[PDB]
Design a protein around this ligand. Structure first.
Ligand SMILES: O=c1[nH]nc(-c2c(N3CCCCC3)nc3ccc(Cl)cc3c2-c2ccccc2)o1
Length: 134
């Protein structure tokens, strides 16, 4: 078994702060921001050996990434950016960096009490999204 153990499960969005502003800073257009911002996704995290899979299921888009910690991969984001992503496990936090067009955003996923707290940062703008077990 593993420490990445505390992330496995089906996590439903329960609260969001500043996500519209984060998306604006990322470069997401009006209509996509509106529709994406409405969604209440489930974030489904599973582990099989060294491979971690994170699925996002929602009324807007269903997305999935599978990766090995520390090993860069291709990701197409829900807003259709083509990004180069690397995910590491640092001090018990999953740290996800996306690079594209000379830009960068960092997404951290942390267990706090019975929640999964996700912090997304694009320059000075941070959004916090809180998820609970489904
Ligand atoms: O699992 C989920 N919850 N939220 C997302 C998520 C996201 N996340 C946040 C959680 C951590 C990984 C990054 N970044 C986005 C960036 C641009 C756009 Cl237009 C949408 C998203 C979305 C997204 C939102 C609503 C419906 C589907 C997807 O992915």
């Amino acid at each position: 078994s593993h420490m990445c153990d505390a992330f496995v499960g089906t996590w439903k969005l329960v609260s969001s702060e500043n996500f519209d502003d984060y998306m604006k800073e990322v470069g997401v257009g009006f209509a996509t921001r509106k529709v994406a911002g409405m969604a209440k996704p489930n974030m489904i995290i599973s582990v099989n050996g060294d491979v971690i899979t994170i699925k996002s299921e929602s009324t807007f888009k269903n997305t999935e990434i599978s990766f090995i910690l520390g090993q860069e991969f291709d990701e197409v984001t829900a807003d259709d950016r083509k990004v180069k992503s690397t995910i590491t496990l640092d001090g018990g936090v999953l740290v996800h960096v996306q690079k594209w067009d000379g830009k960068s955003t960092t997404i951290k996923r942390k267990r706090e009490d019975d929640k999964l707290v996700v912090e997304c940062v694009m320059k000075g703008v941070t959004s916090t999204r809180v998820y609970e077990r489904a």
